[PDB]
């Protein structure tokens, strides 16, 4: 009922900013495959990523550092999906908001994004 | 079995070479409070944040844009925890790997991080 109002705003907006491109639907298309991924695990995955870079930075500047980086690499083998989510977040966060194609793609995809985001929270 | 022992030895001998502070334990201290947070919701929260910025950037360059930003703000009301996780990820991911205090803090915090990251996947 609110949805009709939103449909009207998107249409009239696309008329003034002249089928379509898509920017967020490709992210929505990979969302169910992420049903398992938790935020706790994504925070832990960031920390392991930082330890790999740290252990590497220390190395260039040792049986210790070597065994630690090896166990971190082994363990991050278990956090491949968490890592992908993070690269997806970074990818979305990178996007040029002031670009026509992204504007267009974004307007096309708004109601899909808004609908899925509403469902998420009941 | 004697594997965590191995890791303890590597960190100790490494801290001997690099002569506590804490950088990641404060993030571990807020991990259980994130038990609810899913990756699906964190991806959707990124999208809603970018729609708000987009609608704003379009404004400076309208009943339409205003009603849309209002519905996005209303819905992001439901995603405050998701937003905080994202800011936490960004903040952690920024931290200066080539700094002594962070090096020291990071070595102090490694086994706690590694233990919690191991039990996440068992």
Mutual orientation of helices B39-60 and A100-120 as an angle, nearest 10°? 140
A114 closest CA partner among B61, B60, B88, B54: B54
Sign of torsion, CA B94 B99 B102 B106? positive
> A 50-69 residues with CB below 8 A of B?
50-51, 53-54, 57-58, 62-65, 67-68
The answer to whether A25 touches B43, Cβ cutoff 8 Å, is no
Contacts of A72 in chain B (CB under 8 A): 114
Contacts of A15 in chain B (CB under 8 A): none
Question: Residue with structure tokens 């990756």?
Answer: B39
Q: Total domain count for chain A? A: 1
Give CA torsion, residues A75, A78, A83, A84, to 10 deg.
160
In sequence order, the 6+-apart residues with CB closer than 8 A to the CB of A12 are: B64
Q: Which long-range contacts (CB under 8 A, 24 or more apart) does B68-73 make?
A: B68/A6, B68/A9, B68/A10, B68/A13, B68/A110, B71/A2, B71/A6, B71/A114, B72/A114, B72/B48
Which domain covers residue A42, as residue numbers? 2-120
Tell me which residue in A42, A79, A97 faces B50 most closely, judged by beta carbons. A97
The answer to whether A107 touches A19, Cβ cutoff 8 Å, is no
- Cα A51 to Cα B41: distance, rounded to the nearest angstrom: 26
- Cα B82 to Cα B45: distance, rounded to the nearest angstrom: 7
Torsions phi, psi for B38 (to 5 deg): -105, 155
B22 closest CA partner among B118, B112, B121: B112
The answer to whether A43 touches B39, Cβ cutoff 8 Å, is no
- The number of residues in chain A equals 122
The verdict on a CB contact (< 8 Å) between B50 and A88 is no
The answer to whether A76 touches A63, Cβ cutoff 8 Å, is no
- Cα A106 to Cα A113: distance, rounded to the nearest angstrom: 9
CA distance A109 to chain B (A): 10
SS3 per residue for B48-108: HHHHHHHHHHHHHCCHHHHHHHHHHHHHHHHHHHHHHHHHHHHHHHHCCCCCHHHHHHHHH
Tell me which residue in B39, B88, B110 faces A85 most closely, judged by beta carbons. B39
> Tokens standing for B70?
């209002």
The reported resolution of this PDB entry, expressed in Å, is 2.3
H or E segment to which residue A47 belongs: helix A39-60
Contacts of A86 in chain B (CB under 8 A): 89
Contacts of B72 in chain A (CB under 8 A): 114
Interchain CB contacts (distance < 8 Å): A and B: 177
Tell me which residue in B27, B43, B118 faces A89 most closely, judged by beta carbons. B43
Q: Which chain A residue is nearest to residue B63, measuring alpha carbons?
A: A9
B33 closest CA partner among B79, B76, B81: B81
């Amino acid at each position: 009922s609110e949805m009709t109002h939103l449909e009207t705003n998107i249409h009239s907006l696309q008329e003034h900013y002249k089928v379509s491109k898509s920017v967020f639907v490709p992210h929505l298309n990979q969302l169910n495959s992420k049903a398992s991924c938790t935020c706790q695990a994504l925070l832990l995955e960031r920390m392991l990523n930082i330890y790999e870079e740290l252990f590497q930075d220390m190395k260039s500047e040792r049986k210790d550092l070597d065994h630690l980086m090896d166990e971190v690499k082994k363990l991050r083998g278990n956090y491949k999906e968490e890592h992908k989510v993070w690269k997806e977040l970074q990818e979305m966060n990178s996007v040029k908001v002031k670009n026509g194609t992204i504007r267009g793609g974004a307007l096309n995809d708004f109601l899909m994004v808004f609908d899925r985001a509403s469902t998420e929270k009941h």
